[PDB]
Design a protein around this ligand. Structure first.
Ligand code: CLA
Ligand code: CLA
Ligand code: CLA
Ligand code: CLA
Ligand code: CLA
Ligand code: CLA
Ligand code: CLA
Ligand code: CLA
Ligand code: LHG
Ligand code: BCR
Ligand code: SF4
Ligand code: SF4
Lengths: 37, 733, 80, 75, 144, 40, 165, 64
């Protein structure tokens, strides 16, 4: 029941190494630059 | 103005890039935030601790999950001697085919990393036998991580926020943590060993499905309630027992054999069961010492107030210290890091010489990594212990409320303390370096018999007191007629003496002149590092060169070029300089541990005995000799499984060298260089259409010291980690 | 903006005012010293934190003190 | 500048003198390809005489890399 | 003495120009103008680099930050014995005058000035940092 | 001559003579008593 | 013997070490003439090597498994078994010289503090005074102790500057 | 008539002074009621190179 599929690394490695960092950097860059009301 | 950081208006109004760097670096200094109150300070810290706890249990869950999913635990348990554990799988699209083949090993489906953390031996010892055992543990700890995270949220809510006085109830917290956190946890761990771990070591499966119908001992609790507690120590595992099987096994659940299991070369499980039962009773008892709502016990303030020597030798004594400790978090954190930092060293010292996990000794790479791992962490924690002691003096120390007590009197004779630490450091350095250089000159001129080799008689005399008969002192446990030898001759000496006199294990290794010199170098490291840290704390509040240093804080750049120059004058800078000496000290310790063990593991201890008395031997026979396989991980002909450590080895040298740039060249040079870059961008067509929102500036004076120290430390760690693992694993693994 | 404070040990030598490269300090009448004048810091918003004033003060310990504080375009000495 | 020139002459004089009195130059001229140039000799104290290596020509001394033997031959 | 009014049409020294001059800051935040009278044409050193010739009579220069204006003022006073004065000019057109704030250079004591940031105590009589803790912001004992 | 002897009394000149003497004594002792390791 | 060590005179490894060093010297010898300058120097070295190994054995040192002398530092073990000359006796030899140097320097420093310009007496040494103090330092342990008992060795706590605390 | 005599030696008691617990020579004592009338000179300079400083009446005591 626990064993993940044999293709899990193919999806999660690019996802956590290329995709989430891109969204995280965009989120952080916008946040720090945001001006107070 | 900018939103980030929300906790400091001074930073948010800064138009330069310093706002970004400083916002990150002051996030967790809650005392410096805008609008902070004492009560809000404690509630934030309480919430932060729940977050740390959740990360720890999630990190542990990830290790359990990946070993079960991608490791070879079930195969390793069958033949732990001749199988390398697997940490996790590799999916790197940058790999070439030779790399994919090189890292395929251990019968795995594809490329994998070999584990060095020893979790296999630990988990196997405590009763884990199958991948499903690890899967259930992983889900359980992921759930525990979630619960702590929820509790962190819960106790921030309006009706669940503890008051300020709740965090300052010292007597009640000590009673619970000693009896419940320590005592009951150790009692519960005894339950696991008696019910699960020990039976699994004797070939009997015990799980949640059948543990209520399995008797840990043939006589169930009759000896316990009748006082005949000796019945639990009868028929222990014999010397022929094969771990994990019922052949040669016994029945006892509590013993004091005192030695090593002959097959696994690790501590007996029945001794570790009786160990944890013993301290649990002591800790539960010790947790009934302090006052609470029931009218009995001590109040810690009364104890401190009493202990004033009648002769006035310690002045006011310990009067006023309860408020000094109970009101300052930096004082409490300094005591916590100092205590935990020392215990981390103790863990490293005792785990390599009294290996508690089955088949841990034969895994040389694991033993090397575990000792180095915890000694470097202990070193960092000790530096932090003194840093927060220095922060206490600046921020929390109140001279009026500590008038004449022990703490105040430490500042009275701080010059005497620092002067004597200075003398000891100079004495050890002069004579330790001098003897090494003398021995080097003798070796260079071809007269090895002219060198100064001092026998460690004092340390060899201690080993005699413990039963090591090699030196012929015939002292205490080394003499068969002493009362000490006789009394323990029926409980643990037969096992202890057998192990200490076995020269193939690391229990009280034989020492000689080579160990004399290295130990005195270690003392130099401890004393000098203490000197730097102690000066940084005692001089934190002021000095002749800066009488009012307290008014500037713990960390400031300098007081300018006046009065001769004041670079690195803050207490923050004393810690910064002390980190270098800490790395140097722990480096000497870990080189000494590693080289003395490599020669033992190869059987040629004579190399260390002969080559360790001069510094060319270390450079030649340890660093240069053992780098041969590391730097051949990849070469113009191909690569092998060590190419990752070869790559990481150079990776460390690069980060280390990059740190020199931030430490040698200082800000003024770089700020003027950045000003031409600002000019160039504005005048460049097609690029001045784009523009920045934060004005570029050079790193600050203080920032570059931290950034330089971070690169220095990281390169330090990664270089030796790659060499330590590669030299040990390739040689034997 | 940095913080600059003048303490009552000032002897009115005027050296701090001459040293300052941003005209942050000035001398004002006083009755607490022989010179009958004291240093003043009316324009600290222009202070950059060089501490040339502290280098120039003869009194021991200093009578003028600079505490580096919040940064800005003026205090960071930027021309861009 | 005269002081700097005077110092160089002492230094140059020492190099020529040590070639005359503490060198194997004459032996080197006969067998240049097998004899190692040497123009410094150490005293036998505290066991430092091991630095007087076997350089050829029945001579013991420190091998020099300053190229003075080649310069002298050319002149 | 009355506050001088800046004359934007004042002639400027004979200077070829350099790359060390004003940047985009002058167009968005502020810049500084220094003016003085010259007895005779003479060569002086620009704080931005290079040499310029001052015309006889009024002269005017524009600089990127205050320290540059007061650096030129020191040169003109010490060597050429002149009496320059400079302003702060904002992009909206407002002009702020300073140095000399009251017409007399700050080194010379003048009646009418009000002491600022003066503590009637010594450095050694400040309170301990613990007594100014949790005051809403990082505060030194000297501030209170 | 008074000034010249004053020059010889300067710190660098004294140290050179003193250490030249001190070194010479140690060198000469080891020339006549080579390889001392134990008082004996 | 002590700590498992054995006398170097009875040590097999110690004897073998001497042969190795002499063999190395002999190998270089046979490439020279009988009485040439290099040969004489090599023979002199061999004589010192033989003398050195005889002296250390005659001194009754202890050799380890490495076959190299080891020194005994505990005063009780040294005096018990006649190893006082390794560390114990040289300990009091050094302290006498170290105290001599330090005491002489302290006497000179006190002497010039009374002069009008002490600083000029430190860069420019008063050689006549220094030689006078150099000879009187031979009795420093006696003079040092008497100062301690009379209470003039240490300054008063009230006459020493210290930082704020 | 106020303060120690000119040329006499006094011991400094200002903890923040470079010459705390040290002896200096009194140069002059102001009689105008200023905050720090006593002027003291020292034979050893402080970190800034100064050898003179002003002290209040209660910050200086006679040698011993
Ligand atoms: C803090 C613990 C931790 C750490 C350091 C790692 C580290 C790693 N994991 Mg693992 N993982 C963990 C916990 C952890 N994992 C847990 C608890 C689960 C169960 C949900 C998984 C499930 C998981 C999968 C399915 C995969 C990895 C993989 C990886 C690798 C690449 C990173 C990745 O894709 O993550 C992905 C992480 C997740 C999907 C779970 C993250 C959960 C937190 C709360 C966010 C890397 C070795 C990949 C691998 O093995 O590549 C070869 C891969 O495919 N992990
Ligand atoms: C975990 C992080 C990570 C991952 C998963 C990758 C993955 C990859 N890198 Mg690496 N790389 C990384 C980090 C990473 N890199 C970092 C940190 C650096 C800097 C040190 C580099 C520097 C680097 C270089 C310099 C190069 C690579 C290249 C590659 C490729 C090698 C395999 C190949 O033959 O691709 C072949 C690739 C393809 C057949 C195409 C794959 C898909 C493309 C790239 C994107 C498609 C997008 C799609 C059409 C639209 C958007 C979809 C999206 C919204 C879901 C592969 C795509 C090589 C390459 O080919 O890059 C292009 C290459 O030259 N990387
Ligand atoms: C029985 C009741 C009880 C219990 C179980 C706890 C438990 C805890 N409290 Mg405490 N607490 C209590 C009552 C209790 N408290 C009461 C009554 C009060 C009010 C007065 C408080 C007030 C309080 C505060 C204010 C805080 C805590 C915190 C904590 C946590 C400390 C961190 C931790 O996990 O250390 C675990 C420590 C150990 C298991 C022992 C460590 C020392 C041993 C000797 C190390 C070596 C052991 C062994 C060899 C290691 C094996 C390792 C393995 C890999 C093989 C912990 C969960 C802190 C926290 O984190 O809160 C979230 C915190 O901030 N408590
Ligand atoms: C449990 C222990 C503990 C706790 C609760 C704290 C808490 C605190 N410490 Mg203390 N400290 C500790 C341990 C602890 N410390 C230790 C072990 C040390 C010794 C190393 C120190 C040394 C220390 C100093 C010197 C200072 C503090 C300060 C602080 C305060 C601010 C922290 C901050 O803003 O960080 C912000 C965090 C950062 C800027 C980044 C931290 C990470 C560093 C730079 C290393 C990063 C390495 C990186 C991950 C490697 C990447 C590798 C690559 C290959 C990928 C805060 C109250 C500061 C303070 O204000 O005190 C009053 C302060 O001056 N601490
Ligand atoms: C190999 C590098 C090295 C060395 C040898 C030293 C040596 C020393 N450091 Mg330093 N240090 C280093 C690196 C080093 N440090 C680094 C990288 C840092 C980080 C910035 C520091 C930061 C630091 C601090 C913060 C402190 C020290 C201190 C010390 C002293 C410790 C006590 C001691 O050993 O006394 C014995 C002395 C020595 C071993 C020094 C070398 C002596 C030589 C061999 C004498 C040769 C004389 C001979 C006649 C030849 C002269 C020739 C010449 C005339 C041409 C000592 C002077 C502490 C100190 O000063 O304590 C009093 C101290 O507080 N160090
Ligand atoms: C650059 C200048 C220079 C240098 C570095 C040396 C260096 C040396 N000379 Mg040479 N020498 C020089 C110039 C120099 N010499 C000149 C110009 C002359 C001509 C007068 C000599 C004449 C000379 C003689 C006659 C001898 C040396 C010797 C020596 C050695 C021992 C010196 C010593 O400790 O004296 C003792 C130290 C003090 C008196 C102080 C040493 C390698 C000796 C040698 O090599 O013996 C084997 C030796 O006998 N030199
Ligand atoms: C901690 C520093 C240290 C120590 C303790 C020693 C100790 C010793 N060294 Mg070694 N050495 C050192 C550093 C040190 N060395 C260094 C840094 C170097 C490199 C330059 C050397 C290079 C070196 C050499 C090359 C030699 C020694 C030798 C010696 C011996 C000299 C005995 C002697 O001269 O008696 C002389 C007797 C005396 C009494 C001298 C003192 C005279 C006064 C006037 C006595 C006054 C009494 C009242 C002795 C065992 C020699 C030896 O044979 O060792 C086995 C030797 O050949 N050393
Ligand atoms: C630096 C500390 C130190 C240490 C760890 C030792 C260690 C040792 N000494 Mg040594 N000793 C030292 C300093 C030290 N000594 C000093 C400074 C002196 C005075 C100069 C002596 C004088 C001395 C004598 C006279 C004797 C020893 C002996 C011993 C051994 C056993 C007794 C002992 O001292 O127990 C541990 C040490 C201490 C607690 C420190 C104080 C030790 C005192 C001074 C001597 C105790 C002697 C003891 C009563 C002898 C009883 C008979 C014995 C066979 C059991 C042991 C190897 C004995 C020996 O040779 O045994 C084989 C012996 O007879 N020592
Ligand atoms: C020959 C026989 C010699 C006997 C000498 C006895 C000296 C007793 C100590 C006085 C010392 C003395 O004057 O104490 C005074 C002071 C204690 O201060 P208080 O204010 O508490 O007490 C003052 C007392 O004088 C009266 O109450 O302690 C110290 O300064 C050092 C204490 C050392 C404590 C040592 C603990 C034991 C270690 C092991 C030592 C070996 C065992 C035997 C000796 C105890
Ligand atoms: C500066 C400061 C600080 C800090 C501090 C520190 C950081 C410290 C540390 C410290 C340390 C880190 C210490 C340690 C110690 C230890 C000890 C003291 C030990 C002991 C031991 C013993 C006593 C033992 C004994 C024995 C033996 C040897 C054998 C057998 C068994 C027995 C047990 C008998 C604080 C926070 C307070 C605050 C204020 C300031
Ligand atoms: S602060 Fe110092 S330099 Fe300025 S007037 Fe006062 S005494 Fe003179
Ligand atoms: S720190 Fe610099 S700018 Fe500020 S008052 Fe002092 S001299 Fe003037």
């Amino acid at each position: 029941p626990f064993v993940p599929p044999s293709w899990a690394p193919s999806v999660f490695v690019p996802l956590t190494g290329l995709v989430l960092p891109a969204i995280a950097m965009a989120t952080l860059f916008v946040y720090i630059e945001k001006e107070a009301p | 103005t900018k939103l980030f950081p929300k906790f400091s208006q001074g930073l948010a109004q800064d138009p330069t890039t310093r706002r970004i760097w400083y916002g990150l670096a002051m996030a967790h200094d809650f005392e410096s935030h805008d609008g902070m109150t004492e009560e809000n300070l404690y509630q934030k810290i309480f919430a932060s601790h729940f977050g740390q706890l959740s990360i720890i249990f999630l990190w542990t869950s990830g290790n359990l999950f990946h070993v079960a999913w991608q490791g070879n635990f079930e195969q390793w348990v069958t033949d732990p001697v001749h199988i390398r554990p697997i940490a996790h799988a590799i999916w790197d699209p940058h790999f070439g085919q030779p790399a994919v083949e090189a890292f395929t090993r251990g019968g795995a489906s594809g490329p994998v990393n070999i584990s060095t953390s020893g979790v296999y031996q630990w988990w196997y010892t405590i009763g884990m036998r199958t991948n499903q055992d690890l899967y259930v543990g992983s889900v359980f700890l992921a759930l525990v991580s979630a619960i702590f995270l929820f509790a962190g949220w819960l106790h921030l809510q309006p009706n669940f926020q503890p008051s300020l006085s709740w965090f300052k109830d010292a007597e009640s917290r000590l009673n619970h943590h000693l009896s419940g956190l320590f005592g009951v946890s150790s009692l519960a761990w005894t339950g696991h060993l008696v019910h699960v771990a020990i039976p699994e070591s004797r070939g009997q499966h015990v799980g949640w499905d059948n543990f209520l119908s399995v008797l840990p001992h043939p006589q169930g609790l009759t000896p316990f309630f009748t006082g005949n507690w000796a019945a639990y120590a009868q028929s222990p595992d014999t010397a022929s027992h094969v771990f994990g099987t019922a052949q040669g096994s016994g029945q006892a659940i509590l013993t004091f054999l005192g030695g090593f299991h002959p097959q696994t070369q690790s501590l007996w499980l029945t001794d570790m069961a009786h160990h944890h039962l013993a301290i649990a009773v002591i800790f539960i008892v010790a947790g009934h010492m302090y006052r609470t709502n029931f009218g009995i016990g001590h109040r810690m303030q009364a104890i401190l107030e009493a202990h004033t020597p009648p002769s006035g030798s310690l002045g006011a004594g310990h009067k006023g210290l309860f408020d000094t400790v109970n009101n300052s978090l930096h004082f409490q954190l300094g005591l916590a890091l100092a205590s935990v930092g020392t215990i981390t060293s103790l863990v490293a010292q005792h785990m390599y010489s009294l290996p508690p996990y089955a088949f841990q000794a034969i895994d040389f790479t694991t033993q090397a990594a575990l000792y180095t791992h915890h000694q470097y962490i202990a070193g960092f924690i000790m530096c932090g212990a003194f840093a927060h002691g220095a922060i206490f003096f600046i921020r929390d120390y109140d001279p009026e409320q500590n008038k004449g007590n022990v703490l105040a009197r430490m500042l009275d004779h701080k010059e005497a303390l620092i002067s004597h630490l200075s003398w000891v450091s100079l004495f050890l350095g002069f004579h330790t370096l001098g003897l090494y250089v003398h021995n080097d000159v003798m070796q260079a001129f071809g007269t090895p018999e002219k060198q100064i080799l001092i026998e460690p008689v004092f340390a060899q005399w201690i080993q005699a007191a413990h039963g090591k008969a090699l030196y012929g002192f015939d002292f205490l446990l080394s003499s068969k007629t002493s009362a000490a030898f006789a009394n323990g001759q029926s409980l643990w000496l037969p096992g202890w003496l057998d192990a200490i006199n076995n020269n193939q294990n690391s229990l009280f290794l034989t020492i000689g002149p080579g160990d004399f010199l290295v130990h005195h170098a270690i003392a130099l490291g401890l004393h000098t590092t203490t000197l730097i840290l102690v000066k940084g704390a005692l001089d934190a509040r002021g000095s002749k060169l800066m009488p009012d240093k307290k008014d500037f804080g713990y960390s400031f750049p300098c007081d300018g070029p006046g009065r001769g120059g004041t670079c690195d004058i803050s207490a923050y800078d004393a810690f910064y300089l002390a980190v270098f000496w800490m790395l140097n000290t722990i480096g000497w310790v870990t080189f000494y541990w590693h080289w003395k063990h490599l020669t033992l593991w190869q059987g040629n201890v004579a190399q260390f005995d002969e080559s360790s008395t001069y510094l060319m031997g270390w450079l030649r026979d340890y660093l240069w000799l053992n780098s041969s396989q590391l730097i051949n991980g990849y070469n113009p002909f191909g690569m092998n499984s060590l190419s990752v450590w070869a790559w990481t080895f150079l990776f460390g040298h690069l980060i280390y060298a990059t740190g020199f740039m931030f430490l040698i060249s200082w800000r003024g040079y770089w700020q003027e260089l950045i000003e031409t870059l600002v000019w160039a961008h504005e005048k460049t067509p097609l690029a001045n259409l784009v523009y920045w929102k934060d004005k570029p500036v050079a790193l600050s004076i203080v920032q570059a010291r931290l950034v330089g120290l971070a690169h220095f430390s990281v390169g330090y760690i990664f270089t030796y980690a790659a060499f330590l693992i590669a030299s040990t694993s390739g040689r034997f693994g | 903006a940095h913080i600059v404070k003048i303490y009552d040990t000032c002897i009115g030598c005027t050296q701090c005012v001459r040293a300052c490269p941003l005209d942050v300090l000035e001398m004002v009448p006083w009755d607490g010293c022989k010179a009958s004048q004291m240093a003043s810091a009316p324009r600290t918003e222009d202070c950059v934190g060089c501490k040339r004033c502290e280098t120039a003060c003869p009194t021991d310990f200093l009578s003028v003190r600079v505490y580096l504080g919040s940064e800005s375009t003026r205090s960071m000495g930027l021309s861009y | 500048h005269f002081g700097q020139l005077g110092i160089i002459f002492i230094w140059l004089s020492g190099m020529y003198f040590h070639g005359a009195r503490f060198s194997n130059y004459e032996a080197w001229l006969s067998d240049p390809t097998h004899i190692k140039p040497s123009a410094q000799v150490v005293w036998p104290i505290v066991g430092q005489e091991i630095l007087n290596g076997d350089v050829g020509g029945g001579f013991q001394g420190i091998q020099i890399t300053s190229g003075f033997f080649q310069l002298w031959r050319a002149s | 003495w009355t506050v001088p009014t800046l004359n934007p049409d004042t002639p400027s020294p004979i200077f070829g120009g350099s790359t060390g001059g004003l940047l985009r800051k002058a167009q968005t935040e502020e810049f500084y103008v220094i003016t003085w009278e010259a007895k005779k044409e003479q060569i002086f050193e620009m704080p931005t680099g290079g040499a310029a010739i001052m015309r006889q009579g009024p002269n005017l220069l524009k600089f990127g930050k205050k320290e540059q204006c007061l650096a030129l003022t020191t040169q003109l006073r010490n060597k050429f014995k002149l009496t320059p004065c400079f302003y702060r000019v904002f992009p909206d057109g407002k002009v702020q005058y300073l140095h000399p704030a009251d017409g007399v250079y700050p080194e010379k004591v003048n009646a009418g000035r009000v002491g600022a940031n003066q503590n009637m105590r010594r450095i050694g009589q400040n309170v301990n940092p613990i007594k100014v803790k949790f005051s809403g912001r990082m505060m030194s004992p000297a501030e209170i | 001559m008074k000034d010249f002897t004053t020059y010889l009394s300067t710190a660098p000149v004294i140290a050179t003579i003193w250490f030249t003497f001190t070194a010479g004594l140690l060198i000469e002792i080891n020339r006549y008593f080579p390889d001392p390791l134990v008082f004996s | 013997d002590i700590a498992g060590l054995t006398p170097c005179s009875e040590s097999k490894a110690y004897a073998k070490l001497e042969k190795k060093e002499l063999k190395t010297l002999e190998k270089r010898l046979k490439q020279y003439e009988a009485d040439s300058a290099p040969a004489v120097a090599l023979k002199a070295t061999m004589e010192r090597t033989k003398a050195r190994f005889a002296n250390y054995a005659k001194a009754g040192l202890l050799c380890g498994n490495d076959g190299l002398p080891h020194l005994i530092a505990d005063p009780g073990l040294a005096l018990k078994y006649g190893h006082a000359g390794e560390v114990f006796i040289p300990t009091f030899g050094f302290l006498y010289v170290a105290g001599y140097i330090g005491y002489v320097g302290r006497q000179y420093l006190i002497a010039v503090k009374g002069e009008a310009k002490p600083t000029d007496k430190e860069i420019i040494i008063d050689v006549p005074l220094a030689t006078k103090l150099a000879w009187q330092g031979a009795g420093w342990p006696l003079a040092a102790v008497q100062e301690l008992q009379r209470g003039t060795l240490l300054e008063k706590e009230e006459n020493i500057t210290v930082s704020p605390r | 008539e106020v303060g120690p005599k000119r040329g006499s030696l006094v011991k400094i008691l200002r903890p923040e002074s470079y010459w705390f617990n040290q002896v200096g020579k009194v140069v002059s004592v102001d009689q105008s009621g200023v905050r720090y009338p006593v002027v003291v000179r020292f034979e050893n300079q402080n970190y800034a190179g100064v050898t003179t400083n002003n002290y209040a009446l209660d910050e200086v005591v006679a040698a011993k």
